Structure 1
Amino acid sequence: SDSLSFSFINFDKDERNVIAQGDARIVGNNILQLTRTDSNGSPVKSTVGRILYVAQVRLWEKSTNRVANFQSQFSFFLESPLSNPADGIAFFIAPPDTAIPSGSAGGLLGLFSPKTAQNESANQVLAVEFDTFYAQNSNTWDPNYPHIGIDVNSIKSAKTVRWERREGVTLNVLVTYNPSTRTLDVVATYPDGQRYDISVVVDVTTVLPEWVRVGFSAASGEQFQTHNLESWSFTSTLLYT
């Protein structure tokens, strides 16, 4: 598998190529609703939902010293009646058998377990998070404001940028990885043009195994909001260093 690409303009309730985990489901109006809702569509507490694309990605190959580039383009929106809505949505990459960890319904975003969430040697997760909940006596690892972060085997982001959450508004995101510069970059844009950029140097060959799956995760703990993925397109190609 030297390359893979796919796109979802919207989401099909009869989709065949998506592994859904936890509370994730595709709605009648073709939106991927990651976190659980009640029967009126209102967000609920203590929920994780994730999706992965079914086909595995060859992220790198040691025998040929190849590493893949990738791009992930997606749009999402969040809704909540709360002044401190939680917890957030993330694009992520993990081993193919990745499953929702225990204790992840909350600030761990469905991605980490409490005992190991800040121990990089215990994890294999690369993620780009949109984090709306940052209370300093609880999400102690966060900066004290809403933020976009790049997470490298830890819920404490390697780097963040201050972000503004906008109730019901769709954010457009492009995540790219350049293996020649080992740079993971993120550009997020709201409809009025407000832009957010964050990037880190990261060697994926030390973070993740050779074969991975890619997808999204979201969670709510005591505070809550819906996490709605509208669309997603992904591409990856193995390249020589």
Structure 2
Amino acid sequence: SDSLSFSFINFDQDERNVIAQGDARISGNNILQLTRTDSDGTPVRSTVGRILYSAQVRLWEKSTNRVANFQSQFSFFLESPLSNPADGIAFFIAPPDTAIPSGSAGGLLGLFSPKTAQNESANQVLAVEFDTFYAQNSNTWDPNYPHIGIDVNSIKSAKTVRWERREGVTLNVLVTYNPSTKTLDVVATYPDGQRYQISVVVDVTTVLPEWVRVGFSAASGEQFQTHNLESWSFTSTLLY
């Protein structure tokens, strides 16, 4: 597999190329609802939901030293009745058999396990998070404000940019990886043009195995919010 690209303008309830994990569901409105809701559609506590595209991505090839670029465009919105809505949605890359880690329903966003969430040598996850909950005595790894973060085998982001949550408002996001500069880029924009940028230098060949899957994860612990992905398009090309 030298390249893979796909696009979801919206989500089909009869979608064939998605792996749904945990509470992830596609609504009759063609929205992917990651975290669980009750019978009235209200977000609930202690829920994790993830999707992965079924086709695997060859992110790099050790035997010829090729490394893939990639680009992921998506838009999402969050809804909650709470003052401190939690926990956040993330675009992430992980090994093809990745499953929801134990104890990940909360600040670990469905991506990490508590005893190893800050130990990079125990993880294989590259993620772009949209973190809404940052209480310093529980989400201790976080900056003390909502943020967009790039996670490199740790729930403690290698870099963050301050971010404003907007109840029910769609955020459009472009994540790009340039192999030649080993730069992972993140641009996020609200409908009014309000923008957020963040980037890090990361060598994916030391962070992830050669074959990966790509997708999204969201979680709520004691505090909750819905995490609604509306669209997603991805592209990756393996290059010398």
Shorter-chain TM-score above 0.5: yes
CA distance in 2, matches of 1:68, 1:112: 25
Residue by residue over 1:184-215, the C-alpha shift from the partner in whole angstroms, topping out at 9 and shown as x without a partner, is: 00000000000000000000000000000000
Deviation track 1:162-183 (CA, whole Å, cap 9, x = no partner) reads 0000000000000000000000
The secondary structure found in structure 2 opposite 1:115 is: helix
Q: Distance in 2 between matches of 1:27 and 1:238?
A: 34
- Aligned partners of 2:138 and 2:162: how far apart in 1? 19
Q: Secondary structure at the match of 1:180?
A: coil
SS in 2 for 1:205: helix
Query: Residues of 2 paired with 1:167 and 1:68: CA distance?
Result: 35
- CA distance in 2 between counterparts of 1:148 and 1:156 reads 12
Divergent runs of 4+, >6 A: none
Deviation string, structure 1 residues 15-40 (Cα, Å, up to 9, x no partner): 00000000000000000000000011
Deviation at 1:118, TM superposition (A): 0.2
What does residue 66 of structure 1 align with?
66
1:98-136 Cα offsets, whole Å, 9 max, x none, are 000000000000000000000000000000000000000
The TM-score normalised by the length of structure 1 is 0.99
Q: Deviations over 1:32-51 (max 9, x none)?
A: 00000001100000000000
Local SS of the residue matching 1:64 = coil
Gapped regions of structure 2 (runs ≥ 5): none
* Cα shift at 1:64: 1.1
Is 1:21 matched with 2:21?
A: yes
Task: Within 5 Å, give how 1:25-174 maps onto structure 2.
Answer: 25-174=25-174
Work out the CA distance in 2 between the residues paired with 1:109 and 1:55.
Answer: 23
SS of the aligned residue for 1:63 comes to coil
| Whole-Å separation in 2 of the counterparts to 1:9 and 1:202 | 29
Q: Distance in 1 between matches of 2:114 and 2:95?
A: 19
TM-score by length of 2: 1.00
The SS at the match of 2:138 is: coil
Q: Aligned equivalents of 1:214 and 1:108: distance in 2?
A: 18
Q: Deviation per CA, 1:39-78, whole angstroms, max 9, x where unpaired?
A: 1100000000000000000000011110000000000000
Q: How many residues align?
A: 240
Q: For 2:134 and 2:73, how far apart are their aligned partners in 1?
A: 25
* Aligned residue in 2 for 1:219: 219
Q: Distance in 2 between matches of 1:192 and 1:43?
A: 26
Distance 1:24 1:11 in 2: 12
1:234 deviation in Å?
A: 0.1
User: Within 1, Cα distance between the matches of 2:116 and 2:230?
Assistant: 31
